[PDB]
Design a protein around this nucleic acid. Structure first.
Ligand SMILES: [Mg+2]
Lengths: 134, 1212
DNA sequence: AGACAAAACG
DNA sequence: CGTTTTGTCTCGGCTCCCCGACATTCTC
């Protein structure tokens, strides 16, 4: 009834256990097989290897496990850059966030889950950001 | 010495250009460049602009806009009716429930199609007015027709009944909306014509034709009599079609001064002439002595099969509808209290006019009757004011400083020629120009009758009293007669003589009961202003009466005199009122002349001129002309030129000549060019493209440096218009500022003639080069025809010359079948020096010797002209064989549009009407999205539908074009059966079966062709077609409308390639392009469903290169070594459909022979264009083509080291 | 009348 | 698949601004 996507922060909060409630919430999202964008996967890999210094082998294995069983990667859309340029005029965010939103919308995603994106804001009348942890 | 010469040849939609560096004295030189720019235009435009038939895109856009405007205003009227009725509590509850009254006022709620009278309960529709239906059935039974009729016919029964009986309020609302639907014909001005205005549609029979003994053209013209006792105004020759013939005319009768009717005649055809049909219907309704509604009702009682809409009453004067509605409303106001509730009237007024207190107050004095007819249903807006578009004075300006800290000029509008001031100015001018002559010896007899100021005062006094003057009146004035003298103007012509004041004085004289001094100059001006500014009947009469009250004049004969004053003709002078007021004092003489009436500056100039002192604002030509103006009293009776100079200090328009110093001036000129500024769009487009091409050439070959182009030549070959304007504009580039070159056009501009061009071409052998160039097409046509009639051997030249058989020689011309002849003509023109044009335009010498020098300098020994240089033919061939035709493209799909609408804005605690801009992004679609015909979707079980295709059916008239094959395409099977039976009964001949007489007979006897089972008459039948038609829209019933792509909208043709290498082709619908461009995305998707990457997209007029069969062009580039072979493999896209893309070689303009279904031959087969190359290899172009990009001058563009570097150097 | 868009015909 | 054939929205009224071509008279 509504295609749902996620950002890196959701999977990070899942991976982090300092915050039991937020980790629980993020894992609760993942029980719904939410969609996701490949750029989210790449950014997750980078953050894993930089902040947490985890091994390349372990990070790759976990990426494969999650992409196989829990979540669903979204095929990169060739119209991502043109649309992102279209979104930039009306929207002033980080180009990375703009790219994520561009790909999510181009895949008909109806809800995007993230914190640092001015929650509740509607992007081009096609996708409303939802902040779940509140 | 070295001269840069730029030759231009301008066609209807083509611009050939050549640039040469010639040194004629030494017979040296070389062709620097050559090319042709093509503006695509269909042959229909070329063949229609000669005669003219709405040949303009702007006119078509305006037509659509007007249609849309009428539709929108009707919808607004309906919504206002909805609001008013809902407040009045008249609408039925089920109907009112579905209409928005809060946000989208009066409109139906989204995705709803409510019907006022049909109530939907649990999926069943029931009629609302049962008792009225029963009454109508009772009336029908009384008429003895039938008892089974559609429910909706009750509307007319109610319309009849409301006139003298009470009806339910919902019925009244239905009636009112029905009236809103049909408003009738009405003309804004009105101006009831001749009180009789007979204009009566009558049908007369010819009694006899007494030959009138009027022998004309070897035949005696007969007269005509009518049983009524009327004689036809015009005589007749063809007796066969007149004797005892029942003809119908529209006769106009006017009571002539003798006291008798001056009946006129005008032949008309009923059911074919708008006026005839309208007048016939009006007369028929009037004779019945009843309102249109009851006329329709009774016609329906008599003939229950009658067609009402479009057949019985199409269009009639709005007075009928207004009278019927007034009667109905007045009668119903006697019964329904809500129509008498002042509270409800105020409520409705506030609802409609919450923000217009003035109009609210004005309406508060009226009643519901006025609100319903005058304000809501029958409110027609007046014409927009065109006064803003009037021309401006050439003399008086004003200067003011805006909020931007600039100082810009406002213009003064011209004076309406009917103005008394302009009349006086013109009369003085004519007086000064007048001068008499004697018939006998033709001597300037004047200066003896108009020699002292008294004579001129007498003449002016005489002229004022009149409205026009002529030979006899003017000669008789001086006591002179015709038999000795004349007046230097057209002997039989009349001239305006201050008709404004005349007419005013005459209508003031008819009023009587006033002293013969009321009409003074001030009162005259006031009356003229009243007549000119109040162009409205009611306003005009109110203004008349008010004027008659303020001035103590009996308003009894005054309005009678002035109520029928003819409106002034729309025409304006060159100068404004201010300039005319300034110039009149200088022009006047005698008692009408007084020194104090000259403004301060002009008086200062007069003092300076008489003094003879020195002023920078006064020229030497002044004192030369003003030698006689010694004293102030010499400043009397000054002609236009003298007074003009004195008032403003310029000897008329001296022009500015101007001189452009670089391409920047030209590009500014182009930027500030205004649309619709010339004769027609075609010449404007040609001129603007010519200027752009000239700028490109200047930049490329001279860096836009000053005086780079030594000389420019022009040729055209109706089109004459662009001959002088282009020369004048381009004079600014090739001018000389030393003073030698002065005039309308620079002396360096050298227009040519076809004589020089053709004679140079023949003498110079360029004809031979052209024949050689075009010959291969003619051998190809020979092969195609398997004959040898398209090429003829000649022994004088010992070669084949191209030719066409006589049958294919209707309008063939060897030159027009290509695009490069424009460039050839440009080259010919560029080398034709001023000597050549002078020699061949004035070859008449009066002596062999004087023109012998030009002969020797320019003609070989008079046989032929010398070449500009030794290798001219070789250079021309080599350049012509390497010319890429550049085509202008129009790929507009969406473009931003601005909307400003009136609205009440709240500022400083006040509501004020002003223009607010529309917010959000509002695009305008710059192409027709679909064809006009709309078809419905059908499912026929007895026809196979392949996947991806649908059946769509549309109504068509049954005519002779229905054969068995076509008869097999009707959706209905009973109709197919009946039609087949009828056609078989008619020997299987549709021409006989489905003629109008045949169709009438079939409708009469439908039993015999339907197994004896009854059947409704057949007039139209739904024919189906299997194809791919898309929905018009997605809201309401628009999903039920299926249409086809509009002509010339398959603008994009995508080509993808997979990893393997095979190519995929697609045609993108215009709609998808619209969404993609709205989203900021590219027009063509960069990847198809299979994931094949997009190689590129093609659009009409795009240029592609098809490599040779052996060539492997994967990363070729190197688009600079373009030889005749490479250029010969360049094609231009023409049209697209599905996966098919048609091409034509770039250098081809017109086919040697087109395709005819009978002979079945053409230069490029049935489509006049091929999907493959024309060469023997005949390879699929789309399979190996590569797109190329060319500029206005026809130079290909390919990525290079410098290009790539710059790509992100611009960003660095 | 002209020439596109697509059915229709092989 | 390659080629040819086919169908394509149509008619009425009236007013008010502008430009240009050609003639005539006059002036610079
Ligand atoms: Mg981010």
């Amino acid at each position: 009834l509504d295609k749902i996507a996620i950002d890196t922060n959701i999977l990070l909060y899942a991976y982090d256990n300092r915050d039991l409630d937020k980790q629980d919430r993020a894992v609760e999202i993942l029980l719904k097989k939410p969609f996701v964008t490949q750029l989210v996967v790449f950014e997750f890999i980078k953050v894993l290897e930089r902040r947490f210094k985890m091994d390349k082998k372990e990070i790759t294995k976990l990426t494969i496990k999650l992409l196989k069983e829990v979540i669903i990667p979204l095929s990169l859309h060739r119209d991502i850059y043109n649309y992102s340029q279209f979104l930039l005029q009306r929207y002033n965010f980080g180009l990375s966030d703009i790219l994520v939103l561009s790909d999510s919308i181009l895949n008909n995603c109806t809800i995007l889950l993230s914190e640092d994106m001015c929650n509740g804001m509607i992007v081009d009348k096609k996708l409303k950001i939802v902040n779940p942890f509140l | 010495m070295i001269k840069n010469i730029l030759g231009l040849a301008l066609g209807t939609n083509s611009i050939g250009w050549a640039l040469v560096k010639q040194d004629f004295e030494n017979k040296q030189g070389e062709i620097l460049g050559m090319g042709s720019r093509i503006i695509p235009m269909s042959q229909d435009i070329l063949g229609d602009f000669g005669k003219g038939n709405s040949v303009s895109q702007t006119a078509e856009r305006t037509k659509y806009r007007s249609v849309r405007r009428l539709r929108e205003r009707f919808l607004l009227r309906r919504e206002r009716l909805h609001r008013v009725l809902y407040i009045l509590n008249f609408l039925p509850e089920h109907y009112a429930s579905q209409i928005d009254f809060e946000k989208r006022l009066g409109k139906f709620k989204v995705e709803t199609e409510p019907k006022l009278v049909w109530k939907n309960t649990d999926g069943q529709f029931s009629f609302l007015f049962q008792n009225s239906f029963n009454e109508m059935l009772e009336d029908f039974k009384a008429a003895g027709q039938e008892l089974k009729i559609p429910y909706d016919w009750t509307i007319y029964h109610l319309r009849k009944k409301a006139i003298s009986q009470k009806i339910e309020k919902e019925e009244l609302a239905w009636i009112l909306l029905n009236f809103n639907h049909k408003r009738g014909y009405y003309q804004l001005r009105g101006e009831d014509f001749e009180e009789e205005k007979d204009k009566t549609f009558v049908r007369l029979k010819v009694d006899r034709i007494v030959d009138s003994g009027e022998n004309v053209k070897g035949k005696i013209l007969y007269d005509v009599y009518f049983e009524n006792g009327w004689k036809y105004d015009k005589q007749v020759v063809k007796t066969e079609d007149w004797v005892d013939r029942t003809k119908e005319f529209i006769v106009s009768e006017s009571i002539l001064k003798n006291g008798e009717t001056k009946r006129t005649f005008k032949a008309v055809d009923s059911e074919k002439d708008w006026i005839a049909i309208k007048t016939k219907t009006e007369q028929e309704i009037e004779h019945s002595h009843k309102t249109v509604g009851t006329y329709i009702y009774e016609t329906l009682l008599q003939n229950p099969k009658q067609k009402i809409k479009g057949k019985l009453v199409r269009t009639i004067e709005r007075k009928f509808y207004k009278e019927e509605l007034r009667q109905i409303l007045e009668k119903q106001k006697e019964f329904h209290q809500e129509l008498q509730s002042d509270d409800l009237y105020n409520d409705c007024i506030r609802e409609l006019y919450r923000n217009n207190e003035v109009h609210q107050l004005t309406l508060r004095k009226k009643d519901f009757v006025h609100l319903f007819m005058e304000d809501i249903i029958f409110y027609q807006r007046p014409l927009r004011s065109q006064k803003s578009s009037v021309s401006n004075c050439t003399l008086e300006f004003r200067k003011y400083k805006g909020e931007n800290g600039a100082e810009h000029t406002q213009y003064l509008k011209a004076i309406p020629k009917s103005n008394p001031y302009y009349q006086e100015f013109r009369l003085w001018q004519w007086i000064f120009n007048l001068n008499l002559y004697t018939k006998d010896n033709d001597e300037n007899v004047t200066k003896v009758f108009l020699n002292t100021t008294q004579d001129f005062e007498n003449l002016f006094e005489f002229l004022n009293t009149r409205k026009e003057v002529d030979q006899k009146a003017l000669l008789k004035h001086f006591k002179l007669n015709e038999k000795t003298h004349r007046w230097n103007f057209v002997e039989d012509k009349k001239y305006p003589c201050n008709e404004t004041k005349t007419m005013i004085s005459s209508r003031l004289d008819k009023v009587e009961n006033i002293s013969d001094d009321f009409l003074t100059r001030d009162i005259e001006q006031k009356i003229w202003h009243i007549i000119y500014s109040v162009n409205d009947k009611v306003e005009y009469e109110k203004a008349l009466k008010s004027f008659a009250r303020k001035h103590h004049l009996d308003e009894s004969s005054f309005f009678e005199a002035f109520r029928k004053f003819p409106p002034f003709k729309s025409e304006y002078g060159s100068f404004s009122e201010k300039a005319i007021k300034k110039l009149l004092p200088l022009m006047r003489l005698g008692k009408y002349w007084n020194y104090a009436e000259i403004d301060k500056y002009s008086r200062e100039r007069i003092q300076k001129i008489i003094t003879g002192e020195y002023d920078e604002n006064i020229k030497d030509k002044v004192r030369e002309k003003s030698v006689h103006l010694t004293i102030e009293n010499d400043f009397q009776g000054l002609q236009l030129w003298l007074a003009q100079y004195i008032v403003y200090g310029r000897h008329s328009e001296a022009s500015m000549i101007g001189k452009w110093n670089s391409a920047n001036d030209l590009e500014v000129f182009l930027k500030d060019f205004k649309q619709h500024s010339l004769r027609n769009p075609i010449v404007e487009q040609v001129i603007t493209e010519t200027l752009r091409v000239v700028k490109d050439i200047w930049l490329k070959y001279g860096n836009g440096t000053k005086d780079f182009f030594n000389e420019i030549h022009i040729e055209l070959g109706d089109t004459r218009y662009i001959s002088k304007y282009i020369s004048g504009i381009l004079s600014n580039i090739v001018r000389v500022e030393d003073g030698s070159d002065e005039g309308v056009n620079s002396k360096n501009i050298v227009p040519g003639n076809g004589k020089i061009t053709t004679q140079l071409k023949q003498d110079w052998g360029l004809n031979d080069v052209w024949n050689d160039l075009i010959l291969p097409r003619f051998e190809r046509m020979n092969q195609l025809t398997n004959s040898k009639d398209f090429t003829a051997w000649n022994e004088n030249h010992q070669k084949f010359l191209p030719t066409v058989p006589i049958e294919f020689s209707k309008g063939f011309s060897k030159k027009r079948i290509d695009h490069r002849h424009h460039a050839l003509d440009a080259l010919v023109i560029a080398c034709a020096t001023t000597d050549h044009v002078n020699l061949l335009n004035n070859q008449s010498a009066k002596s062999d010797t004087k023109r012998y020098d030009l002969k020797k300098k320019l003609m070989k020994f008079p046989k032929q002209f010398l070449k500009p240089w030794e290798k001219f033919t070789v250079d021309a061939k080599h350049n012509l064989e390497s010319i890429i035709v550049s085509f202008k493209q129009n790929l507009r799909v969406i473009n931003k549009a601005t909307n400003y609408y009136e609205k009440y804005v709240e500022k400083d605690g006040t509501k004020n009407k002003e223009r607010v801009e529309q917010a959000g992004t509002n695009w305008a679609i710059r192409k027709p999205m679909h064809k006009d015909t709309v078809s419905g979707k059908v499912d026929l079980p007895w026809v196979k539908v392949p996947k991806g295709k649908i059946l769509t059916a549309t109504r068509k008239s049954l005519d002779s074009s229905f054969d068995l094959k076509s008869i097999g395409s009707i959706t209905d099977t009973g109709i197919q059966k009946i039609l087949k039976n009828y056609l078989a009964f008619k020997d299987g001949n549709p021409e006989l079966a489905f003629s109008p007489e045949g169709i009438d007979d079939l409708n009469k006897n439908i039993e015999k062709y339907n197994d004896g089972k009854p059947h409704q008459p057949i007039n139209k039948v739904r024919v189906f077609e299997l194809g791919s038609k898309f929905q018009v829209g997605q809201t309401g019933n628009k999903k039920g409308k299926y249409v086809e792509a509009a002509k010339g909208t398959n603008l994009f043709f995508a080509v993808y390639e997979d990893e393997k290498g095979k190519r995929s082709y697609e045609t993108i619908p215009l709609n998808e392009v619209i969404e993609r461009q709205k989203q900021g995305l590219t027009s063509v998707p960069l990847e198809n469903e299979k994931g094949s990457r997009l190689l590129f997209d093609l659009s009409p007029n795009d240029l592609v290169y098809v490599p040779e069969i052996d060539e492997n062009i994967d990363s070729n580039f190197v688009f600079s070594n373009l030889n005749k072979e490479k250029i010969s493999r360049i094609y231009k896209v023409e049209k697209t459909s599905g996966t098919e893309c048609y091409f034509v070689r770039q250098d081809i303009a017109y086919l040697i022979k087109q395709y005819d279904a009978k002979t079945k031959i053409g230069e490029l087969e049935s489509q006049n264009k091929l999907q493959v190359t024309m060469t023997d290899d005949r390879i699929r172009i789309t399979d190996t083509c590569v797109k190329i990009n060319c500029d206005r001058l026809g130079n290909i563009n390919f990525i290079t080291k410098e290009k790539i570097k710059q790509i992100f150097n611009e960003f660095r």
